[PDB]
Design a protein around this ligand. Structure first.
Ligand SMILES: CC1(C)O[C@@H]2[C@@H](CO[C@@]3(COS(N)(=O)=O)OC(C)(C)O[C@@H]23)O1
Ligand SMILES: [Zn+2]
Length: 259
């Protein structure tokens, strides 16, 4: 590759050359990529997709959050884990990060019936393997964020932290908060979509079991705008961080299922 990967917005907003998504190397040009559009009525119900069990999601922690130049990322350090959800094993939580724009009708990586949401939050987990790498080594939990006028109090520790990490490779410590503070009510997480795909940044490894929850997180417009207002892609602060979103990939021969 002849330069570092970037999102489209970065190449459009700066004169410094970088590799846009359609030009990404690694496995990014293979045929089981993510994100995708999900046609909700065409996803077949699979009875074996039961409720998720969250561990360590309720416990208050002071999380480390950092700007890695592509997004903001909470380091979960195996301090939380998941099971159920039609998953073959329990999975350990590694990180939480987001993708967003500054318009209410875009910012999500996945789309539901052709609608993008204002943001998409990803909680990345790793498989507890046995003896006997796989297509489902990583489980990413995806939550869509809808913009409105409801102040989401649970997001406030994260939103306030953002001022402190404007430039890449900066780290800060969030005020006391839980993962559940960031999510819809647990009982509303029974309905989700499931498919097999890839990581959405290079090298786009095809090792992800995806879950996209039907229920949106409600965040105030100004809490969403805090992300593009407070963060930058570069140490020079010439390009505000937003549209950190990979364009949609074809489902191809794959199947999307739902609980
Ligand atoms: C903050 C951001 C965007 O997310 C981090 C890191 C590199 O890319 C990721 C993307 O994970 S994803 N979007 O497929 O859930 O892939 C890994 C390596 C799992 O870490 C993710 O930058
Ligand atoms: Zn992501």
């Amino acid at each position: 590759a002849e330069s570092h990967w970037c999102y489209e917005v970065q190449a459009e907003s700066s004169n410094y050359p970088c590799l846009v998504p359609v030009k990404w190397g690694g496995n990014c040009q293979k045929d089981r990529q993510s994100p995708i559009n999900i046609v909700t009525t065409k996803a077949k119900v699979d009875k074996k997709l039961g409720r998720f069990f969250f561990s360590g999601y309720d416990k208050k922690q002071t999380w480390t959050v950092q700007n890695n130049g592509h997004s903001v990322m909470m380091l979960l350090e195996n301090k939380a884990s998941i099971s159920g959800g039609g998953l073959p094993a329990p999975y350990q939580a590694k990180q939480l990060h987001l993708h967003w724009s500054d318009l209410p009708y875009k910012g999500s990586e996945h789309s539901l019936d052709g609608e993008h949401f204002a943001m998409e939050m990803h909680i990345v987990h790793e498989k507890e393997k046995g003896t006997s790498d796989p297509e489902d080594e990583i489980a990413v939990l995806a939550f869509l964020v809808e913009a409105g006028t409801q102040v989401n109090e649970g997001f406030q520790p994260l939103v306030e932290a953002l001022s402190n990490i404007p430039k890449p490779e900066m780290s800060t410590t969030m005020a006391e908060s839980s993962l559940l503070d960031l999510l819809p009510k647990e009982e509303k997480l029974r309905h989700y979509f499931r498919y097999l795909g890839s990581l959405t940044t290079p090298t786009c490894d095809e090792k992800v079991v995806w879950t996209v929850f039907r229920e949106p997180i409600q965040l105030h417009r100004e809490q969403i705008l805090a992300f593009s207002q407070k963060l930058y892609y570069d140490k020079e602060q010439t390009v505000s961080m937003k549209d950190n979103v990979r364009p949609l990939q074809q489902l191809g021969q794959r199947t999307v299922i739902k609980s």
